[PDB]
């Protein structure tokens, strides 16, 4: 969806979630005015050893 | 002889003894130091032949001439 | 009682102001104090303050005099009679009449632990362990780099330079 950034330095994959209506972290989600489309940004922290290490 | 009118002995900034005819340093005299300043300015003959002493003369001292350059008319010489 | 001889080594005024050894008056004086003479503990570095102190002359205003050699206030008295021992190996040889070559680990002051085990002693310093030459683990050793591993470069580098400085044609 949208764009992919492969980020092995942070052991991470990040996407721009485009909703057409533990390793998962979701942030910055807001809908469009008048319902329907909702957008957001997702955080693929794969192994559960980065999530803790690389997570506030 | 005529430039030694002060309480101290007047010497140039760069004073060096010349070599005599036999090829060794002659401590009995001092070379008249004179340099040439930069952007297209000729050294007056008085800075070469003359025997005056000045530590602020741009031709016979270590004072440099930097970028700014102007012109004008002499107003007072007192 | 029979009494011995003592030397006054400190004291405090009735108001708690200490006594300065140098000051040779009876009353109280205000001086510019650093941490050098003791009577003022600085907070910052190089910070002085004008504090009040007492002279080195004893008088009736004194409340307690440490004059030992005690802790006696002034009629009364009070009294002070190896918390950790030395740590350097050179100090161990001094205390137990030990030479330079004999081992001192056999004569290190060991303290036991008695609680709900362990016979403790300080961390040693300055002995003869094979890795004591960590001090030369290499650590020393590694003058190498310095030792011509670098220095010969400075004659490698130098030399070939004078070559293409001499072509100059």
């Amino acid at each position: 969806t949208r764009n992919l950034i492969v980020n092995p330095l942070l052991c991470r994959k990040q996407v721009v979630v485009d909703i057409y209506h533990q390793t998962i972290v979701l942030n910055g989600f807001v809908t469009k005015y008048g319902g329907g489309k909702t957008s957001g940004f997702a955080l693929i922290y794969d192994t559960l050893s980065a999530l803790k290490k690389f997570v506030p | 002889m005529a430039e030694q009118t002060e309480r101290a002995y007047q010497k140039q900034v760069f004073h060096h003894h010349s070599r005599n005819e036999k090829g060794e340093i002659d401590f009995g005299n001092v070379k008249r130091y004179h340099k040439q300043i930069g952007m297209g300015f000729v050294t007056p003959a008085e800075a070469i032949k003359g025997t005056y002493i000045d530590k602020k003369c741009p031709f016979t001292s270590d004072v440099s001439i930097r970028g700014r350059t102007l012109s004008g008319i002499v107003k007072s010489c007192h | 009682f029979k009494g011995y001889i003592l030397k006054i080594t400190g004291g405090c005024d009735k108001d708690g102001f200490p006594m300065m050894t140098g000051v040779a008056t009876n009353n109280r004086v205000r001086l510019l104090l650093d941490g050098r003479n003791g009577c003022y503990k600085p907070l910052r570095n190089g910070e002085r303050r004008r504090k009040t102190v007492r002279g080195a002359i004893v008088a009736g205003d004194i409340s307690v005099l440490n004059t030992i050699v005690k802790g006696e206030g002034e009629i009364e008295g009070v009294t002070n009679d190896m918390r950790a021992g030395p740590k350097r190996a050179s100090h161990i040889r001094k205390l137990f009449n030990l030479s330079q070559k004999d081992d001192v680990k056999k004569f290190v002051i060991r303290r036991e632990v008695a609680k709900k085990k362990r016979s403790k002693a300080p961390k040693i310093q300055r002995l003869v362990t094979p890795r004591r030459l960590q001090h030369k683990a290499q650590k020393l050793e590694a003058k190498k780099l310095h030792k011509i591993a670098m220095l010969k470069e400075a004659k490698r580098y130098a030399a070939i330079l004078n070559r293409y400085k001499v072509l100059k044609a």
Binding site: - | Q4, E6, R7, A8, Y9, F27, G28, V30 | -
Partner: protein, 167 residues
């Protein structure tokens, strides 16, 4: 403290100069140290940026150079005989740059004996008189209040005549 700023002066027009700031460490000066003649007494002064200046309060010895013979020797300073700036420096024997002083030419004489095989006690006539009289004329060329030492040179032909006639 002593200041070196130009905000306390007057303009070239003679008008007074008003004040906007206070004194600052950048334009800080220090009390001069008049290096007299006597037992060695020097002090270390922390300057700006942590550098250290050797403040020579009192000195007796100094290193002096003979230009003709290309030698430099240590020598005890005897007297100060001429200061071109202030005469009060002569009485107090203050050591500053350009102060004509009198030193004993003992090491220089000994060096001449070992090198030529002769004794001094062509050279300019007044130089010989200083050798036999035990007091030769030298000029201080260092800044004792900054470097903490007296470095100078023995006066020679044209400089000697000018300074000797002044005395």
């Amino acid at each position: 403290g002593i200041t070196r700023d130009s905000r306390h002066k007057r303009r070239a027009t003679g008008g007074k100069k008003n004040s906007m700031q206070k004194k600052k460490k950048n334009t800080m000066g220090r009390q001069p140290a008049n290096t007299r003649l006597g037992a060695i007494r020097v002090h270390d002064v922390r300057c700006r940026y942590g550098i250290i200046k050797r403040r020579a309060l009192r000195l007796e010895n100094g290193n002096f150079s003979w230009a003709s013979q290309s030698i430099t020797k240590g020598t005890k300073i005897l007297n100060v005989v001429y200061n071109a700036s202030d005469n009060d420096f002569v009485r107090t024997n203050t050591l500053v740059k350009g102060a004509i002083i009198e030193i004993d030419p003992a090491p220089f004489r000994l060096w001449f004996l070992k090198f030529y095989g002769k004794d001094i006690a062509k050279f300019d006539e007044a130089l010989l008189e200083g050798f036999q009289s035990g007091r030769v004329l030298a000029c201080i060329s260092s800044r004792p209040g900054q470097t903490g030492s007296v470095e100078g040179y023995i006066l020679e032909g044209k400089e000697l005549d000018f300074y000797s006639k002044k005395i």
